[PDB]
Each structure stands twice: as structure tokens, then as C-alpha cells.
Design a protein around this ligand. Structure first.
Ligand SMILES: *[C@@H]1O[C@H](CO)[C@@H](O[C@@H]2O[C@H](CO)[C@@H](O[C@@H]3O[C@H](CO)[C@@H](O)[C@H](O)[C@@H]3O)[C@H](O)[C@H]2NC(C)=O)[C@H](O)[C@H]1NC(C)=O
Ligand SMILES: *[C@@H]1O[C@H](CO)[C@@H](O[C@@H]2O[C@H](CO)[C@@H](O[C@@H]3O[C@H](CO)[C@@H](O)[C@H](O)[C@@H]3O)[C@H](O)[C@H]2NC(C)=O)[C@H](O)[C@H]1NC(C)=O
Ligand SMILES: *[C@@H]1O[C@H](CO)[C@@H](O[C@@H]2O[C@H](CO)[C@@H](O)[C@H](O)[C@H]2NC(C)=O)[C@H](O)[C@H]1NC(C)=O
Ligand SMILES: *[C@@H]1O[C@H](CO)[C@@H](O[C@@H]2O[C@H](CO)[C@@H](O)[C@H](O)[C@H]2NC(C)=O)[C@H](O)[C@H]1NC(C)=O
Ligand SMILES: *[C@@H]1O[C@H](CO)[C@@H](O[C@@H]2O[C@H](CO)[C@@H](O)[C@H](O)[C@H]2NC(C)=O)[C@H](O)[C@H]1NC(C)=O
Ligand SMILES: *[C@@H]1O[C@H](CO)[C@@H](O[C@@H]2O[C@H](CO)[C@@H](O)[C@H](O)[C@H]2NC(C)=O)[C@H](O)[C@H]1NC(C)=O
Ligand SMILES: *[C@@H]1O[C@H](CO)[C@@H](O)[C@H](O)[C@H]1NC(C)=O
Ligand SMILES: *[C@@H]1O[C@H](CO)[C@@H](O)[C@H](O)[C@H]1NC(C)=O
Ligand SMILES: [Ca+2]
Ligand SMILES: [Ca+2]
Lengths: 80, 644, 80, 644
């Protein structure tokens, strides 16, 4: 009714956050830097490669679900 | 066992054709600069009917300026007010394919999109109209500037679809008089597209084909139920060895048998990209040496021929298709004009594994298979026979024609002796041919002494040869206002595109021999951005494609704020050397980078800037050029001398 | 005021959804399965191993941010 | 290069001690069943003052029933209403450490938590008070049952902290009369704990120490500013080779120099877990063969001694510490009683790389260092000298005492010739000692014929030896109501823990030699759950620890619904064989599994159930037992015969 309208607006904002231009690059940089913490001199490539291979697909996949706010709210039992 | 083939109870599904993908990304990059006659010979092995692969379908990437697996592909609209229908090589390829086979089916699909389109976001569905106009304009451009009819249009390669964009796309196409253009969705998995079609009548009406990637010969209930044509819109992606050929052979038959799929499209068309880039040599054939003219007519070419030379889109599969008693499968087709084609494969598990998905063990042992022709097929008394055996060079027979079969005894029956990894094509058609051209030149490494002054007044292609862009887009550029640097190479991206892959934050184009270890790179550079601008030259660049972000070597950077830096990585996280330099924007400088063993040096206008800087060794990789961010910059008089 | 109260409850429902017992195992299975699509007979181990190593850390890290609903809403410009 | 050492301008930070971790997870598993005198000798090399590693701190995992790297560790509360302060080996270890060194510092930290604390969620912050009560019960139990004073308590290992939980934990501790117990947070990165302390006065008051993991010798601005003690609460985790020893040497000095860290704690204490489990041989020493008594006093033991034998918690670092002109570093500490200790290291980059994080290149070359003792240090006339040289066998010398140094010339100055990969300890203290015990027995593989009938009436430890639980918890069990099976082994988890790692969905305990390839496993099994219950025995189990979910091998399952299944994986996705069997719940059955080359067979009560089932070969791994889900089941009369 009314929490359905607000729920939908929250999902929208959250979506718009991941959809921001800066978001992809900001996440890659965080995740590549954590690669230097997770492993040494030799295996810094494996980690970094895995990140640059799946992060786009993961992030874009999430943006996909955030794009249908009605559906999100329906699952959270705030819409139906 | 006795295998019946009959058309008395009716027919199976309509066959839609076999195809291949050029794009996703820059897979055809090195083909364009092959010398004649070799370039034209390669094209014949791929597209000439009753010769080689004789492909029914050609699927191309609609370039979006982003990195899309083995490089970037140029867009028709770099900027909102920019329109150019002559960049890249996909237009040329489609025209070459169409010249050989006018009945070839054409498909377009975006992987990436230019930045401007997102209107501040890294999402293509921001303004559904602007995105649909961007795409439909390409399709109209294909006809108005190249006389090409695009038959199929996709949504967003291996990325989420928008049902409302799919609806807008139909509207847009129809409005622009392109009612004939069909829509394929969603170039990803069977779901959520299949269930979405069952829940939405309006969406069901606008989607013509369900296109799934690497399905492993199977479909899902919802897809069968949709009543739509089902295609494996992207498959293969395996090294073109005998193993790769086996994988292709098996899926060509079993995609229909197991998954009701009436079309299979291989990624990629031809391996015309540096082998050390991701998924090297994963094309139907190999053509990665334009400097030598050397090409390889790989096994998958002949595996393709077994179907493509003896079938055509519009033929129908019979209801009678299936698996063999001791392993393998058989398909059978008709044109309804009296012709019949029978394709049999016995690919062993060990010699037919694809990259995707997981293949569970199955045994293949020697067998005899008897085939009886019931219905209208019983009137056939003569069949042509074609044979292939994949394996070691000693037992390697590609597309060899065997003795004609005679079924004169009125029985309408015959038997075959079947071993492992064999293909048989039994057809009424007389048109079969194993196409042949004289052997091409021997393989040779990339030239150890190379130069490009980019002094090409009216180039045939938008970019200089052998430069494979891995982030950003580099093009031939003419500056009349300057006589000393009239013809240059320019990086033209001014913003990060709606990325398919994880593009670098700096632009970069690689060239040469990945094996190179000792080298001297020289280039004239020009920074267009005041204060903030930066450019580089590099050597020993080890990684590209989807892993371009991880790339390491020796990078020599110079910034318009009067500074320089030498890094071990494209990311610039690791510093070898740094300091001040007499460098500003809008001024031409000559950069020299020398790398030998553990040590490197750099020169500015022939004067030493830095010397004896210790670098990681051993190390090897390509030479490269680039810019600090997505910014304009020019390059001229490129030179490299290296030792492999 | 009022969207601040609803926003906070949305973050809580989603947060609690990931916090369900069944969630970890469900996600594991999904990604372990997708590993058979991504890779063949040989490399099915690498993918699966990466999954079983980092999903725990990643998932539990997100559950942390969802645990402060006020903070989430402040970033979404529905609270401050 | 003259380096001044002086206490005239005052002192640096208070030194808090060097320690090691037992736990995270089951790292001390195989130590408990070592025969005497070897077990006691190992403990001396670790904890005996002026002997070996002479550790100042012992940090233990507070077992939570979950998989925590190399196995599971038993909780004091398996279920609500359950309390037992005698499970596992951490109580015993702490008591053994305390017997040798009564001034040892004790720390506890949870990795996992029992599932019941989650009340429906896999989250420990559902009821703050309840979780704090669980943790505080452990501290109280340590005191009440073992006379152990826990000095420090942590939050949740490498997992998010809850500010309110930390506050509630402080309240709870104080309420229970444990005001002396200090809190360390958050056993993860510098952030967000450091900034949280600056923004919240109340949180700042309750946190005594900021504990960071694998910091790479550096801290952050917010942590320095907090004014809190900074500890590298988990570091090292590298193979105990000479390279591992170099890593440890370098960080011990530079954690203080570069990051103001006054304590460093190594993961792990001693490698007493199967080497083929994750991070094998990453302890200060090795003791992974209780069956032979063979142990290795690895290099890190002596690297530890260079600091631990000549410093004590409560000493102060001088303001005068730093790096050496041509590479390496020096620290200096006093006790305020006129004693002085100087520790110098020259670890080359190539021989001191840790697993975490990335170490950037730095050069180290031959040099001379001059030290001058200003202030109250000038009055020192004499110094004892200890030396270590890491490297090749031709040049490895550990903790060798050299000729005393005299400064009688009133100069208060001395000079050293330093090469690479060297450690020097210069101290006034006379108490130094390279501890020695005769060489232990030679290494030998796990017995090829092994049996355990679990017939132990009053066991010293809660679980049978050599069984390393990888999911679930297995314990000695006594059932008086049965004479034929009075003493058994029982899986006691009835629900999945609040996991730290990705535990399997089936319980499993591994044993033996990972090299085993042909084997026969036998065990009496008993399913407690009617209808749904299931158990298994297995061979060639190739993975464990944090990778337990990935384990392959040959698994023979029986179910209480009258069925059986043979799988290739613990996950049961791959079936080798399946069918019916005369099996019900609450009945004892004898299971036999035989594996040889490409073939396997299984027996039920000595009768063949399945035979000549083709399995993957080659293959190798441990023997194992387990249950279908987190359910009760019993095992008895275990036997294995194998060929390596
Ligand atoms: C790329 O340049 C490096 C740097 O010069 C080359 O490596 C160097 O090659 C020379 C000749 O092969 C080596 O010299 C030899 O040393 C041995 C003793 O070690 C001596 O017996 C010989 O008479 C000769 O002087 C030199 O050691 C080697 N340097 C390193 C650091 O490996 C490399 O060969 C060049 N590669 C290519 C493909 O051009
Ligand atoms: C574990 O059991 C397997 C299965 O028996 C063992 O492998 C087998 O070992 C035998 C003897 O080493 C091999 O037989 C030999 O065959 C050659 C011809 O190939 C012949 O010249 C010899 O006289 C002998 O008969 C047998 O081929 C081999 N089987 C397989 C499948 O490899 C294995 O050695 C056992 N491993 C351990 C550690 O006990
Ligand atoms: C899709 O293909 C499947 C086979 O993969 C068809 O299912 C049956 O296939 C067997 C032979 O494998 C035949 O004996 C059955 O008669 C087939 N079913 C029917 C209804 O004819 C299935 O029919 C195909 N689906 C569609 C939509 O054509
Ligand atoms: C098999 O297919 C061929 C190819 O289309 C058929 O040949 C054509 O037949 C039509 C009339 O049916 C003619 O108009 C074409 O000119 C023929 N083309 C060629 C190249 O022959 C043929 O009829 C079919 N049937 C048989 C039994 O061959
Ligand atoms: C933390 O340690 C750093 C050194 O890593 C201290 O910073 C300075 O260190 C140099 C020598 O490297 C000294 O000459 C300076 O006197 C130090 N600064 C000050 C203010 O004394 C830093 O002071 C230490 N921080 C704390 C909180 O003690
Ligand atoms: C160096 O440290 C030792 C060890 O504590 C000091 O020796 C102790 O001195 C106190 C009084 O200062 C006595 O009560 C202890 O009995 C002594 N113990 C031992 C083992 O000697 C010593 O004072 C310090 N200073 C010097 C110069 O040695
Ligand atoms: C495959 O089949 C043949 C004939 O039935 C048999 O001899 C062979 O052992 C089988 N191989 C496997 C691995 O099942
Ligand atoms: C290390 O330093 C020494 C002496 O300054 C020098 O001879 C050597 O070349 C240096 N090595 C590197 C790799 O910088
Ligand atoms: Ca020029
Ligand atoms: Ca017993």
C-alpha cells in the first residue's frame, strides 16, 4: 500500500548506487588491493585475474535484480 | 541393431543453419592485413559454398569501444553527435562473406556500449529509446552504406535483458521499416528468458528465437514449451586441435538430438588474434601471421563441411534421429525435393571435451549399424559417402570421399562398420568438394625490426595493422595544421564505455611477439590534455584481453605536469623509477625505451632521462603504447627492434 | 521522518534473509553448480575450490553492512 | 654509518611479547598422542624459558564445532543446556605451557560458534548477551576447572565485529568478576575498528588492544592516533623452511619499527596436522608423526629465541631504533634495570617472503655498522653475542653464541661487519641457552595396518587419536546398555554450526596416509536416525580443511531406508554404484570397502553387496568415516590395511 511505495524507492536508490559510473572501477580497485593482502609476490596474479574475470559479471548480475524493484519487495513481503 | 529412417509419420523441426562468431572481441583483428592471395583464400575456406566450412550464418559484434575478450572493437558512435559506419573490420567481413555466399544469414549483437549512452551510469537501459535508436541505426547503416540485410538482432551478450527494452526494440525496428529483422534473446542461459516468455504474452510475441550459450547439448522444459526456435547462439570456444574438432562434431549432432536446437554458432570464426591473448587458437581455423601469410586449415573446417555442404537452412530434420547402440549418434535431413542427408559421429569422450560445460564419461566401442529407409526414402538407390577420422597424423583423413553406395536390392537397407572418432556423411547430393589451395608460407615470428610511420593518406581500415587495442580505441588521424606530423595514430576515447569486461583505467594497444625479451621501443608522442595529461611506451607486456588490468612489463610514462615515472605494471602500483622532466602538453616529444636483461634506460628527445634501472628478469612480452586515462593523445614514427 | 522508518525496515528484512540458516548452503550449491558450466572435466576443481574458500568471507562481510540499517539509509539519502 | 642508541630523551613503547596460535583449526591435533619423552621435549622447545622458542604468549581457539582451517575444534556447549570443560586439547596445552612458564600470557578467540546460538540464523549477534554469556562461560571454566587465568579475549576471528557486543562483553566480564581480563579487537584489518574507536568514546574505553592480521609491518594513521597498544595478533603462516625463518626474523623487528606494533603472534604454534591439509608445515616447528615420535626443531624456533630469550613483556623499546644504510634493521630494548638487548637482522628479499602480503623488492648488501651508546647505556662495558646465519646447508648456523664484546675503552662504541641473511643479538643478559635433546626417531609413514576398537574406559582426550574431524565432531562414547558395543566413537553434532569456513553438508573424519592408493577399510556402523539416517566409510579422500567440500575419493554409503550408494565425491554428485540393501536404523552393521587400481567392492556383514565397480585411477588419499547430515551415529572396531 504505502510501505510498498517506499520499499520500491529504497531498492531504486540502492540500484542507482551500483549503477553509478564510479562504482565498477571503485570495486575493482578495492578487490585488487585485497589481493595483495590475501597472497604474496608469486600468486598476486591468480587472485587479481579471478577478480578481473568475474567481478563485472557478478556486479552487473546484481544490478539486474535491483532493476525490478517490485519483484524485490514481493520477496521481502512488503509488496504482493 | 537396425536403425529406421522414415518420413511417413511426418517431419522433425526445420533446420536453421550452422554459423560462427566474429567479435567478442577483436578475433578477426589480424586477418585484415594478410597479403593477397592468402586473405582471399582464407575467406573461401570459410564462406565459399561447396569448398570449405561453407558457413550458413555469420554473427558479428556491434562494436561498443569496450574490451570484449581479445581486444576492443570500434563503435559507430564514439560520442552522442558522432556517426561513422566505416570503422573496424566487421562491415568488410560481412561484405566478403556475402560476395561468396549471398544466401548467408547475418546477425548482430552488442557486447559493450559507448559511455555517453548511459547518461551518467554504467547501465544501457537508462533511456530505452536512446539505446534502441543507437542499435537500429547500426542495422540501417549496414544497409545504407554497405547494402547488407541484417537478419537477426540480439539484446546484450551474456548480460541481463530488459523486457521493456526488448519491446521498445521491436517497436523501434518496425517504426524504421525493419519489420523483417528478427529478435533473438537473451544470449545467456535458458532462464530467465524461457519462463518470462511463458508469463508474458506481449514478450512472447516479440521474441523470435531463444538463443542460449554453451548448453552442453541440452535445453529446459520451459524452452521446449515456448514453441520457439532454440539455438545454441554461442558454443565451441575450444583449441582447434583434433580434440576441438571432436567437440564440434559431437555437439553439431547432439544439440538437436538432445536439446531440439536447430542452429549452432561457434565462437570464434577464425583465430586472427595473438595466440598469447585469452583463448588463443579457438577459431574454426588459424590465421595469426599476416606478416608471413601463414595460415592453418584446421580440423573443425572439415567437421563443419560434413553438415554445411550437405544441408541448408530450410531443410527439415526427420522424426527419426538418435543415439547409437555402442555410443555416438546420427541425424538425418530432407529438403522435401527427394534429397536426403545422414550425418553419423562416434566421438570418444577423451577426444571430444569442450571448455564448457562439464562432460560426464561415456564409452564408445566398435559397432555395426544397419540403416533401413522406410517411407519416401525407400525410393533412393544411390548415396554419396564422405568420411573423416580424427586423431594422430598417422590416422588423420579429412573429408575424404568414399565409394558410392548402391541400395538396388529393393531392401532400402545398408550396414556400416563403425570405430571411434569417425564422421560419415551419406547424402544424395553430388555437389560435395574438399576445397584446396596450394600450401601457404611457413610460420615465422613477428619481424625483429619493425616500423610504422602511419603515413597513409586514405587508409582502407580505421586503424594501423598489428596494433591490438586492449583498452581505449586507436585510429589513423590526419592533422593538416602540422607538416612535421601530418599523419598520426590517435587514442579517441574521452570516457570509459559501458564495460562488458574489466577494462584498464589507462588506454593501451599491444603489438609484436609475446616471446620478445630484449627490446628497444621508440615513438613520437603528443599529450593533448593540459596539466593532467599523460602517455607511455612499454616493453615486456605479458597479459591482455580480459586480464589486461593485471598486465606487467616496463612502462615509461611522461606527464604534462613536468614529470616521469617507470612502472612494473600497467596499474602503476609498482615504481621502478620516477622524477622530473621538461614535458608539457601540446608539444611533440620522442620517447626511447631500452630493455636488456635486468636493466632498462629511457630517452627524451635523444637525451638520457634515466639509465641502469633494475627491472624484473627473466621477463617477456609485447611492445605497447597508451594514455594515462580515457584522454586524447597522438603517436607517430613508431619503431621497435627486439630479440626473441 | 517516515521514509527513514520504512528504509530501515527494508535493510532489516534483506539482512535477515541472508542471515537465514539455509542461505549459506544454498549459495554454495548454486556457485559450486555454475562451476560445472564455467569449466570442463579437468578445471572443475579450481573453480569449486575458489568458491569454498571466499564465499564465506564475502557473504558474512555483506551481512555486516546490512546489520547497521541506519548507516545504509544515510548513504541512500533517506536518513541523516 | 654511525647509529646512536640512547635513553636520554626517554623511551619508546612498552614491549608486550612474542607468541603463537594453537587453533584455527586443529593445528595441534597430532601432538596429543606423541609418546613420552618426545611429547614433553616438544613442549620444552616451545615453552621452557631459556631453552628454545621460550614463548611469552599462547593464543588458543575457543572451539565452536565448525571447520576452522585444518579441522573442527569441539565446543564447551554443543547444545543449549550442555556444558563440558574437558573436550579437545586446548585446556591441556594451556596447562602444559603454564607448567613450564607460569608467567606466560593466555589469549582466547572464537572462529566458529555452535548453531544453537544463532536461534535460526547463521549469525552470532542475534542475542548479544547470550553470545557474551557463552564466551564468558569458557573463561570462567578455564579458571574453575583448570586453574587458568585468561588474560585477553577477542571478538570473532577475521569476521565483522558488533560495537554493542564489545560493550556488552565488557559489562558481562566485569559482572562475573573478570575486570582483569582485557579485550582485543577486531582480529581482522586496521579498519573499521581504528576509526570506530576515534568516533565512539564508549567503545574506545572498552577496547584495550587493536589486533590486526598480516599487516606487512605497517599500521594506519587512525591506529597510531588511538593511543592503543597495536599488535600483529596473527602473522607468519609460512612453511617453516629457511625462507619461513627469514620472514619471521624480518617482521619481528620491523613490525615495531614500521608499524609501532609491540607484539607479534605467529599462526601456528607447531605443525601437528596432516601436511596435505591446507597450509601444511606452517608452524614454528614440526610434529606430525605421533606414530613414530619424529619431530623437527625448525629454524623459526631459533629466530624466536633471538628475541624471546633476551626480552620479556614489560621491557621498553628505546626511542633509537631503525633501518640500516644498506638494508636490514635494528631494535633495542631495556628493562629499566640497566639491562640492554640489541637485535639486528639483514634478511634478503629473496629469503624472507611471507605468504601475506605482497613484499616489494629491496636490496641488501655487505655493510659495516657502528653503534654508540649514549645516555645511561654508556656505562655498559660488556655484551654477550648470539648469531644465526640462514641459507643453504653449507652455510646454516643456528643460535650460536660468539665471543663476548667489551667496550672498556670508555668510547661506548663498537662496529660490526654484516652480510646478508644474518641475525645478531647483543645483550647484557647471561641466561642465553641453545636447548638440546637427543635426536628423535627417523620419519616413518603412517602404519600400513591399523586398528582402533575405541575400548578406552577413561580416555585422557575426548576423541580417539589420529582421527581428524573435517565436518562435524566425533567423540569417545560409552553405552552401558550394550555389551557387544560398550565403547564406541560417536558423531555428536545435531545441527550445522555458525560456520567460519564452508563446512561440508555431511560429517567426516579423515585418518592415515594421504599417499595411500590401494586400501581396505572396515568399520562397524550404527544409524541412530530412523528412516532418514545414513553413514559412510571411504578411501582415497584427497582434500580436507577449508577445502573439505571439494573432497573426492570412494564413498560407500548405507541408509536407514534400505538403500546404498557409492560416490566419487563427498557431495555425492557423482555416482559409481547404487541400489537396495537390508539396512535399517538402530542396528549394528559391519561395512567393508576395498579399493585396488581401477576397481572397488563393498561388503555388508561379510557378504558382497557390490563388486568390480570401476573407479577413477590413479588416485590417492586418506581413509574416512562419516554421516549423511549433522546427525547422531556410532562407529566401532575400525580397521584399515593399505599400500602407499
Ligand atoms: C637478453 O639480454 C640478456 C642480458 O645480456 C642476455 O643474457 C645474458 O647472456 C649472456 C650470453 O648468453 C650471458 O653471458 C655469459 O655468462 C657466462 C657466465 O655466466 C659465461 O660463461 C659466458 O661466456 C657469457 O659471458 C649472461 O650471463 C646473460 N645474462 C643474464 C642476466 O642471464 C640474454 O641472453 C638476451 N636474450 C636474448 C633472447 O637476446
Ligand atoms: C595398486 O594396485 C594396482 C592394481 O593392481 C597396481 O597396479 C598394477 O601393478 C602391477 C604390478 O606393478 C602391474 O602389472 C604389470 O603389468 C606389466 C604390463 O603392463 C607387466 O610387464 C608386469 O609383469 C606386471 O604384470 C599393473 O599393470 C598395474 N595396473 C595398473 C592399472 O596400473 C599398483 O601398482 C598398486 N599400487 C600400490 C602402491 O600398491
Ligand atoms: C525435443 O526433443 C526430444 C528428444 O530430445 C523429443 O522427445 C522425444 O524423443 C524421443 C526420442 O529420443 C521420441 O521417441 C519421442 O517421441 C519424442 N517426443 C515426442 C513428443 O515426439 C521432443 O519431442 C522434442 N520436443 C519438441 C518440442 O519437438
Ligand atoms: C536435390 O536438391 C537439388 C538442389 O536444389 C535439386 O536440384 C534442383 O532442382 C530444381 C527442381 O527441383 C531445379 O530448378 C534446379 O535447377 C536444380 N538445381 C540443381 C543444382 O540441380 C534436386 O531437385 C533435388 N533432388 C534430387 C533427387 O536431386
Ligand atoms: C610510530 O612509529 C613511527 C616510526 O615508524 C614514529 O615516527 C617517527 O619515527 C622516526 C624514526 O623513524 C623518529 O625520528 C620520529 O621521532 C618519530 N616520530 C615521533 C613523533 O616521535 C611514530 O612517532 C610512532 N608513533 C607513536 C604513536 O609512538
Ligand atoms: C638485568 O636483569 C636481571 C634479571 O632480572 C637483573 O637481576 C635481578 O636483579 C634483581 C634486583 O635488581 C634481583 O632481585 C634478582 O634476584 C636478580 N635476578 C637475577 C636472575 O639476577 C639485573 O638486576 C639486571 N641488571 C643487570 C646489570 O644485570
Ligand atoms: C567399453 O566397452 C567395451 C565393450 O563393451 C569394454 O570392453 C570396455 O571395457 C569398456 N570400457 C569402459 C571404460 O567401460
Ligand atoms: C644492490 O646493491 C649493490 C651495492 O650497492 C649493487 O652492486 C647491486 O647491483 C644492487 N642490486 C640491485 C638489484 O639493485
Ligand atoms: Ca608521420
Ligand atoms: Ca569398541
Amino acid at each position: 500500500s504505502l510501505p510498498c511505495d517506499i520499499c520500491k524507492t529504497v531498492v531504486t536508490e540502492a540500484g542507482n548506487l551500483l549503477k553509478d559510473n564510479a562504482t565498477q572501477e571503485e570495486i575493482l580497485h578495492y578487490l585488487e588491493k585485497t589481493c595483495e593482502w590475501i597472497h604474496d609476490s608469486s600468486l598476486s596474479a591468480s587472485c587479481k585475474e579471478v577478480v578481473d574475470s568475474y567481478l563485472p559479471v557478478i556486479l552487473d548480475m546484481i544490478k539486474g535484480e535491483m532493476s525490478n524493484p517490485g519483484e524485490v519487495c514481493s520477496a521481502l513481503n512488503l509488496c504482493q | 541393431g537396425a536403425y529406421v529412417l522414415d518420413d511417413s509419420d511426418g517431419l522433425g523441426r526445420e533446420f536453421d543453419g550452422i554459423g560462427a562468431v566474429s567479435g567478442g572481441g577483436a578475433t578477426s583483428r589480424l586477418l585484415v592485413n594478410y597479403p593477397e592471395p592468402y586473405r582471399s583464400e582464407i575467406l573461401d575456406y570459410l564462406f565459399k559454398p561447396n569448398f570449405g566450412a561453407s558457413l550458413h550464418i555469420l554473427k558479428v559484434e556491434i562494436g561498443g569501444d569496450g574490451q570484449t575478450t581479445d581486444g576492443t572493437e570500434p563503435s559507430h558512435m564514439h560520442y552522442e553527435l558522432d556517426e561513422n559506419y566505416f570503422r573496424g573490420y566487421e562491415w568488410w567481413l560481412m561484405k566478403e562473406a556475402k560476395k561468396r555466399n549471398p544466401d548467408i544469414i547475418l546477425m548482430g549483437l552488442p557486447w559493450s556500449f559507448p559511455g555517453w549512452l548511459g547518461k551518467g551510469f554504467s547501465w544501457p537501459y537508462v533511456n530505452l529509446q536512446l539505446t534502441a535508436y543507437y542499435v537500429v541505426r547500426w542495422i540501417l547503416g549496414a544497409k545504407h552504406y554497405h547494402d547488407l540485410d541484417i537478419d537477426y538482432i540480439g539484446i546484450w551478450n551474456e548480460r541481463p535483458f530488459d523486457a521493456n527494452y526488448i519491446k521498445e526494440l521491436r517497436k523501434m525496428l518496425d517504426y524504421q521499416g525493419l519489420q523483417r529483422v528478427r529478435i533473438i534473446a537473451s544470449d545467456n542461459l535458458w532462464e530467465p528468458i524461457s519462463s518470462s516468455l511463458l508469463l508474458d504474452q506481449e514478450l512472447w510475441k516479440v521474441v523470435d528465437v531463444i538463443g542460449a550459450h554453451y548448453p552442453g547439448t541440452y535445453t529446459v522444459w520451459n524452452a521446449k514449451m515456448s514453441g520457439k526456435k532454440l539455438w545454441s547462439s554461442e558454443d565451441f570456444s575450444t583449441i582447434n586441435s583434433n580434440v576441438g574438432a571432436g567437440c564440434w562434431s559431437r555437439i553439431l549432432n547432439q544439440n538437436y538430438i538432445n536439446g531440439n536446437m536447430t542452429s549452432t554458432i561457434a565462437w570464434n570464426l577464425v583465430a586472427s588474434y595473438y595466440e598469447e591473448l585469452p583463448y588463443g587458437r579457438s577459431g574454426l581455423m588459424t590465421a595469426q601471421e599476416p606478416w608471413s601469410g601463414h595460415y592453418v586449415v584446421a580440423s573443425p573446417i572439415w567437421v563443419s563441411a560434413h553438415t554445411t555442404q550437405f544441408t541448408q537452412p530450410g531443410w527439415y530434420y526427420l522424426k527419426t534421429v538418435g543415439h547409437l547402440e555402442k555410443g555416438g549418434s546420427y541425424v538425418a535431413l530432407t529438403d522435401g525435393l527427394g534429397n536426403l542427408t545422414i550425418i553419423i559421429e562416434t566421438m570418444s569422450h577423451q577426444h571430444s571435451m569442450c571448455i564448457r560445460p562439464y562432460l560426464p564419461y561415456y564409452n564408445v566401442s566398435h559397432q555395426l549399424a544397419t540403416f533401413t529407409l522406410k517411407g519416401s526414402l525407400r525410393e533412393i538407390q544411390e548415396l554419396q559417402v564422405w568420411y573423416t577420422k580424427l586423431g594422430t597424423p598417422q590416422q588423420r583423413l579429412h573429408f575424404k570421399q568414399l565409394d558410392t553406395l548402391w541400395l538396388l536390392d529393393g531392401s532400402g537397407s545398408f550396414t556400416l562398420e563403425l570405430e571411434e572418432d569417425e564422421i560419415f556423411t551419406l547424402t544424395t547430393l553430388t555437389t560435395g568438394r574438399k576445397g584446396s589451395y596450394p600450401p601457404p608460407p611457413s610460420s615465422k615470428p613477428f619481424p625483429t625490426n619493425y616500423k610504422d610511420d602511419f603515413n597513409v593518406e586514405y587508409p582502407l581500415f580505421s586503424e594501423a595493422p598489428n596494433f591490438a587495442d586492449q583498452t581505449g580505441v586507436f585510429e589513423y588521424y590526419m592533422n593538416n595544421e602540422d607538416r612535421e606530423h601530418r599523419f598520426t595514430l590517435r587514442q579517441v576515447l574521452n570516457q570509459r564505455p559501458i564495460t562488458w569486461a574489466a577494462d584498464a583505467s589507462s588506454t593501451i594497444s599491444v603489438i609484436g611477439d609475446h616471446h620478445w625479451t630484449n627490446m628497444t621501443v621508440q615513438c613520437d608522442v603528443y599529450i593533448e590534455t593540459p596539466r593532467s595529461g599523460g602517455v607511455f611506451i612499454a616493453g615486456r607486456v605479458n597479459k591482455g584481453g580480459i586480464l589486461i588490468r593485471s598486465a606487467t612489463g616496463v612502462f615509461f610514462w611522461i606527464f604534462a605536469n613536468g614529470s616521469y615515472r617507470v612502472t612494473a605494471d600497467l596499474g602503476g602500483w609498482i615504481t621502478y623509477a620516477s622524477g622530473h622532466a621538461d614535458v608539457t602538453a601540446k608539444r611533440w616529444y620522442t620517447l626511447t625505451l631500452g630493455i636488456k636483461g635486468y636493466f632498462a634506460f629511457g630517452m627524451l628527445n635523444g637525451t638520457i632521462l634515466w639509465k641502469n634501472v633494475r627491472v624484473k628478469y627473466p621477463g617477456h612480452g609485447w611492445a605497447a603504447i597508451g594514455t594515462h586515462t580515457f584522454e586524447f593523445a597522438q603517436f607517430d614514427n613508431f619503431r621497435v627492434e627486439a630479440a626473441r
